[PDB]
Design a protein around this ligand. Structure first.
Ligand SMILES: NC(=O)C1=CN([C@@H]2O[C@H](COP(=O)(O)OP(=O)(O)OC[C@H]3O[C@@H](n4cnc5c(N)ncnc54)[C@H](OP(=O)(O)O)[C@@H]3O)[C@@H](O)[C@H]2O)C=CC1
Ligand SMILES: NC(=O)C1=CN([C@@H]2O[C@H](COP(=O)(O)OP(=O)(O)OC[C@H]3O[C@@H](n4cnc5c(N)ncnc54)[C@H](OP(=O)(O)O)[C@@H]3O)[C@@H](O)[C@H]2O)C=CC1
Ligand SMILES: CC(=O)N(O)CCCP(=O)(O)O
Ligand SMILES: CC(=O)N(O)CCCP(=O)(O)O
Ligand SMILES: [Mn+2]
Ligand SMILES: [Mn+2]
Lengths: 378, 378
């Protein structure tokens, strides 16, 4: 049938690519809602006109005033758009932990949650898991989409290791001393993927990979000591599963988010011609190397937060959101992003308790941001 | 849950490795029959003692007399053993088209056929397919084991291409002029796999990969136009499947036939600890390059034979068996192996007809061998 899709974050990197997939596949998909922040009204107005969709949410009030005739506006506009729109799939391509309430609202409607917004799962943790039925959350994140495909390759007790690939970012091979002089311009240029600013920055600092290690544990229920990271500079292999017999199954394609987007929207069905395939008629090489954990401890820190569990993963992410914003603002140097995450985590023992309510997560995040902000100031 | 296994070709490369997998997994597998040619009686003696199996076929009558206590001897001994032994799995690791009657007898028993002996399927073609039920033939050949695993990644209508990897053999990158000087000793040394003499020679000439393209078509029912080959010198990726959305799924492991052997015996269940997994703690690379079909046309010749169909694939393989033997005997140069195959195939029009009975295949093989022998002697 023709699936009704709500696109949250429609004007961003993932959102724009998702609308193209939808526009190219009108027999399979239909847009029934759009949500954005209000920073790119030209784009949103174009989207309204091209899709015919008037069911729109805009977060910024001043932005919502300028356009007018907007059904949903303000801080919970995205969430209310989800609560009040009949849909089969909600694509959550918001950025940051602010995607948490839309995620919980999406899961309550019973629709499929095509999840690009990894932070909402990392922050919500068990709370999000408790809200979802088996297979209701379908990963858009390239590594997790790859893992889901590779896991068709055996039964649960046959899985030995999940192996996440990391590009290494623009600072692969750099020394700790080199990192001291990193600028936002340098951090904002990713070697293999074109993305929004936050995922781009997080990929450079390796916090993205740490978030993805937590995401893997949550989505697939595999222990942290069986989740590995390998640096693969081409970003063609998107991740791999190693089975108990010694076999590894890997998923590969030229880097293009339209592929995992299309798969998440029409899960479990594949979408013909979503993206280009690898060309095995032209010479190529796929390289692997260990992550330099001394220079890039963000993944080890994510493991520590994940093993502590409960609200600790929301702490990890919230400390990053504050510190990363501080770096972009020129308030701290690049190494201090992960420096501050570590300091906040080291003082966060009280948050190693399972959240009962959304308010427990929000409290954890509030504490974390305040702590990170104090570190930025002093 | 203890599976009864007959091992045909027990004393050879695959056979030996299979007996090791079985010895390591007594709770899963039991040997109930062995067949061999009679050329390695020391090995056969060891195997009889270690398995406690006296249900043994030996092709050479004088050899059977020398070892003693052999119930089946002669050229029909392997077939007889299969017809007269209760088994759950017949592992056919005979070499050459002489595995055909055992293959057919195995299928008639209803047992799973764990097929290493690709030549029996290549030669039998539709005759073998008619004798098999769906899922009855389970591949041992490493590429086809890999493809079977990767095909879990989608539904049949979602498959765009099956991609077979080829090591390129010892003469990877060599010119046509270089091939003229090849000795049997050079051809007998493979860069990535340790195997019996025939598969070793066939891998050097690229006839092995030709046979494997035909085997792929027959096993998986995928048209020749959707079966591709790429050269991968590491032999770590064992084959891949490209799906209609642009996703590729690949299976990889350090080269060790115990992995596909173990999976074939236990299909669909994986066998814990069968082989070592890829280690991503040390830097490495996986390389791909095209095959130069000007120098190595064996794969294109196999496709041509397969497309012609009927007994043409038996002709391709029989011409190879005869020409390969002539090369090993010093009667022809190395490039003449594939040269003779091409000459026989392009004159083989009378054999582009489906075999009604095994005798039709046997007649096609006789014709091809005689044709090849006249090419050698001329
Ligand atoms: N881009 C990629 O390739 C990948 C991204 N991801 C994840 O997907 C998510 C989206 O990333 P990406 O597309 O790069 O991000 P972008 O920055 O490109 O887009 C973010 C979107 O969210 C909207 N937005 C921002 N703030 C708010 C708010 N307060 N309320 C409602 N909407 C808001 C923006 O609207 P506007 O700008 O118009 O205000 C924009 O549409 C992230 O969680 C990211 O980590 C994961 C895998 C790869
Ligand atoms: N080796 C490998 O890794 C791979 C092999 N294959 C395929 O598997 C099959 C076996 O290959 P491999 O193990 O290398 O071959 P080998 O030459 O190592 O072994 C051949 C086996 O067949 C027996 N044999 C030979 N002639 C006869 C006969 N007339 N009657 C009965 N038995 C006979 C031999 O017995 P004896 O020597 O005691 O007389 C031996 O047990 C081949 O079809 C090959 O192409 C496929 C994938 C990889
Ligand atoms: C494409 C994707 O899903 N990402 O999260 C970006 C990955 C870039 P890196 O591997 O973290 O450098
Ligand atoms: C291991 C295996 O299954 N083979 O068939 C040998 C492959 C060697 P090549 O790729 O044909 O050179
Ligand atoms: Mn990712
Ligand atoms: Mn093979």
């Amino acid at each position: 049938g023709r699936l009704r899709v709500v696109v949250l974050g429609s004007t961003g990197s993932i959102g724009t690519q998702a609308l193209q997939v939808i526009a190219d596949n009108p027999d399979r998909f239909e847009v029934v809602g759009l949500a954005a922040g209000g920073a790119h009204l030209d784009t949103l107005l174009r989207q309204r006109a091209q899709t015919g969709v008037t069911n729109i949410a805009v977060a910024d009030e001043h932005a919502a005033q300028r356009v007018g005739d907007i059904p949903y506006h303000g801080s919970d506009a995205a969430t209310r758009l989800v609560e009040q729109t009949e849909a089969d799939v909600v694509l959550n391509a918001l950025v940051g932990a602010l995607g948490l309430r839309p995620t919980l609202a999406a899961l309550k409607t019973g629709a499929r949650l095509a999840l690009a917004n990894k932070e909402s799962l990392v922050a919500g943790g068990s709370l999000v898991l408790r809200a979802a039925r088996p297979g209701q959350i379908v990963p858009v994140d390239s590594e997790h989409s790859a893992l889901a495909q590779c896991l068709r390759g055996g039964t649960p007790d046959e899985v030995a290791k999940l192996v996440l690939t990391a590009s290494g970012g623009p600072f692969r091979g750099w020394s700790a001393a080199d990192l001291e002089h990193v600028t936002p311009e340098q951090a904002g240029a990713h070697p293999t993927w074109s993305m929004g600013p936050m995922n781009t920055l997080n990929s450079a600092s390796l916090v993205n990979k740490g978030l993805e290690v937590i995401e893997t544990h949550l989505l697939f229920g595999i222990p942290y000591d069986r989740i590995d990271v390998v640096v693969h500079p081409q970003s063609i292999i998107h991740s791999m599963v190693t089975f108990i017999d010694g076999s590894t199954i890997a998923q590969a394609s030229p880097p293009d988010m339209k592929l995992p987007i299309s798969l998440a929207l029409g899960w479990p069905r594949r979408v013909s011609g979503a993206a280009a395939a690898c060309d095995f008629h032209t010479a190529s090489s796929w390289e692997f190397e260990p992550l330099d954990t001394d220079v890039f401890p963000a993944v080890e820190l994510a493991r520590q937060a994940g093993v502590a569990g409960g609200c600790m993963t929301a702490v990890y992410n919230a400390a990053n959101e504050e510190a990363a914003a501080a770096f972009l603002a020129g308030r701290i140097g690049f190494p201090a992003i992960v420096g501050i995450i570590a300091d906040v985590l080291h003082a966060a023992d009280q948050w190693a308790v399972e959240p009962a309510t959304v308010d427990d997560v929000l409290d954890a995040q509030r504490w974390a941001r305040e702590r990170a902000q104090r570190a930025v100031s002093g």
